[PDB]
Enzyme design. Structure first.
Site, mmCIF file in Angstrom:
data_model
loop_
_atom_site.group_PDB
_atom_site.id
_atom_site.type_symbol
_atom_site.label_atom_id
_atom_site.label_comp_id
_atom_site.label_asym_id
_atom_site.label_seq_id
_atom_site.Cartn_x
_atom_site.Cartn_y
_atom_site.Cartn_z
ATOM 1 C CB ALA A 253 11.264 80.562 57.890
ATOM 2 N NE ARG B 150 24.713 81.056 54.327
ATOM 3 C CZ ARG B 150 25.626 80.077 54.257
ATOM 4 N NH1 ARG B 150 25.388 78.867 54.756
ATOM 5 N NH2 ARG B 150 26.790 80.303 53.661
ATOM 6 C CG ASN C 114 5.660 69.706 34.251
ATOM 7 O OD1 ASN C 114 5.083 68.894 33.503
ATOM 8 N ND2 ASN C 114 6.290 70.786 33.784
ATOM 9 C CE1 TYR D 202 8.639 82.196 48.167
ATOM 10 C CE2 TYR D 202 7.858 83.774 46.478
ATOM 11 C CZ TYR D 202 8.578 83.490 47.644
ATOM 12 O OH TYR D 202 9.317 84.463 48.236
ATOM 13 C CG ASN E 202 7.453 84.623 38.946
ATOM 14 O OD1 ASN E 202 7.604 85.300 37.911
ATOM 15 N ND2 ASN E 202 8.461 84.009 39.542
#
Lengths: 409, 407
Positions: B259, B186, B269, B323, B317
């Protein structure tokens, strides 16, 4: 969720308000400890968290960042300093190490956007060729691990292989040095002069004739001399060298290319004079002054050249095709001349200020990790860092002084 | 100022919507004119404005930018294209020229922020060792001077010295190529599979077991093959090699490392699983697949690897230390492997998307005033994939409409 009153340099105070933790693994942890032992409080709050990432040679090892930082972030104090120290990625011993060392920047910029209460992040790369003691790293770490770096956040510093010599007095690092500062009558230039005089330097304060009494005022305040000059004139280098000979032993140790003008206009509406004048003051003159003062022997071994780039040079800005071309070119000067100047024992660097207070502005103040505009001292401090005679292993660098401003390339 | 309905690629249509003015002075204006003459309308608006800056060897010469652009901007068309072509600054023949060529980037990014009605800017650097015909420059100029480049803006492209061969049909540039696309069940991956197939390629669509159903559909819709598998697994390179052996003579031309997963958490955290999973999928796996597929010769001469970075990996970010580290890592793979891969005749490059529709603040905070579309990211990737982009390697290009956020 609001702006911290940022801690700034004040004579006599310890560099950090909490203790200093140095963690990680690699070639920097142990000599950095030995070096910072006697001025820092080694392990209160953490005033400073330093992670040696130089030992990370594969992406699987990036986990160590997590393992070190996650348990200790609770203990980072107000305006605390986080610094990751890596090896220069292009100079790594493997492609795996390069990838890992490069990846470190996504981490440190992200962590800047998480830290609270005015705390900041930085990434420092050290050449794999530096000696084991890493004396060339110390000025960078001392500037970062201190109140001086108050408005420098989320950035990347590149230290080369050379050894350094500490100044007689880290609190008076520019003692005995002669510094030329253009655009010195007011604003940032006047503050560079100030911070320069504070650190022990004798300042030649340059500005245009119309900046008359303002230039004398600055010169008097800082214990230096006023030189009334159009930096774009054919004879600028001659007149600067003449003043040096008449008042300062013929030499300068430092040149700050601070003078700058804007003439904002959209490209579609641009005229020859507004293009030319900004190109002349902002790019052609600092190039001519650097090449001419080095070339006539006025600035020589141990010399320091620092230029003012700016966020518009890196990101662009509407109505500033002229100004941004010149600020991008300042980065060009800094990168292009660094190898030639190295061969003559001279360093060259640039500081790129973001939103700095003092003569839409709302957005500009808020749009950074520190949630506030900077002060002229914040820019001066980054520039005095480069000017240090212990900063000889730093050259080719462009450092934003922007609070980690959102805007960029 | 309103956002423009962006023109995107549709077959049979002209690449530009008006005429193509090529100006400036240097080694590129003439040969570029000669190359684009039959496919473009050289000189009703200007659909493109290209300025050769390579002639500029001193800061005093930068005024040529203004002398060229200022009189003609009035007539730049809607969704028009401005490109400045300079010479690689690191390779300049003097420090003056390096300085002047380096300065061009303040110019193209500032002008990106002025241009109206959908029109974009780009800087292209060309190695001073390219031959006068500049055949290696042609794939990049053709991507930029068309609707495919709709959401690329203010960016900087780096073309080396090697010659190129055009594809047989510029409209079917990947005809007869075989491409592996991961995360293809997708979203952006499925759209990359589509655009690839549009361009004539045979797609090997990879995704996870739980996506088996969706992956089969996509493969059938693009005329390719599905292969589900866990890209993190010890056996991934084997399964893909085995699949290539069966269908495509053991060889793939193109690998797209698309991917990727997010497990957002502030670092204070951060738990082991959220760090580790994101590192494994987004960074470890693409690397191991690249090295594995190159290692056993599944990707050889003419090869193309393309990685998905993102603006997070460049700017950072909040809640994405995991990430971002992976996406900066993907830039690391791009840059680190380019030299060794070039020796094997393989290019490697990365696209870094901005805000792509798939909230109010990130949509608008870009020169184009709107979020991107998954097609726009696909086009950038298909541009690198081209058999004609062999002189393009080690590049990281954002597909972000010139988002204000950056480093």
């Amino acid at each position: 969720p609001q702006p911290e009153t940022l801690r700034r340099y004040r004579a006599g105070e310890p560099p950090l308000t909490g203790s200093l933790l140095i963690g990680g693994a690699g070639r920097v942890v142990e000599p950095l400890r030995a070096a910072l032992e006697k001025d820092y409080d080694l392990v209160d709050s953490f005033g400073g968290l330093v992670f040696d990432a130089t030992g990370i040679t594969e992406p699987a090892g990036l986990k160590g960042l997590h393992e070190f930082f996650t348990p200790v972030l609770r203990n980072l104090g107000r305006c605390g300093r986080v610094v990751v120290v890596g090896g220069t990625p292009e100079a790594a011993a493997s492609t795996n190490e390069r990838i890992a060392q490069r990846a470190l920047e996504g981490f440190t910029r992200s962590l800047g956007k998480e830290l609270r209460r005015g705390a900041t992040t930085a990434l420092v790369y050290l050449s794999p060729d530096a000696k084991p003691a890493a004396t060339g790293l110390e000025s960078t770490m001392r500037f970062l691990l201190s109140a001086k770096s108050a408005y420098v956040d989320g950035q990347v510093f590149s230290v080369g292989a050379d050894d350094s010599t500490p100044p007689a007095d880290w609190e008076k690092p520019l003692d005995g040095k002669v510094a030329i500062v253009t655009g010195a009558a007011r604003g940032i230039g006047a503050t560079i002069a100030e911070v320069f005089a504070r650190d022990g330097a004798h300042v030649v304060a340059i500005d245009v004739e119309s900046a008359a009494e303002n230039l004398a005022e600055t010169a008097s305040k800082v214990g230096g001399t006023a030189l009334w000059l159009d930096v774009t004139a054919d004879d600028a280098v001659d007149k600067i060298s003449e003043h040096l000979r008449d008042h300062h032993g013929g030499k300068a140790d430092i040149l700050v290319n601070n003078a700058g003008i804007t003439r904002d206009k959209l490209l579609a509406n641009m005229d020859d004079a507004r293009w030319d004048a900004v190109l002349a003051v902002n790019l052609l003159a600092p190039l001519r002054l650097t090449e001419g003062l080095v070339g006539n022997g006025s600035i020589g071994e141990g010399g320091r050249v620092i230029g003012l780039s700016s966020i518009a040079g890196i990101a662009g800005n509407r109505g500033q095709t002229n100004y941004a071309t010149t600020k991008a070119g300042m980065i060009g000067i800094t990168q292009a001349l660094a190898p030639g100047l190295a061969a003559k024992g001279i360093t060259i660097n640039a500081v790129a200020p973001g939103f700095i207070e003092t003569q839409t502005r709302e957005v500009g103040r808020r749009l950074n990790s520190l949630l506030q505009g900077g002060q002229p001292v914040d820019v001066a401090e980054a520039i005095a860092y480069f000017a240090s005679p212990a900063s000889n292993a730093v050259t080719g660098n462009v450092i934003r002084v922007c609070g980690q401003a959102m805007i960029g390339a």
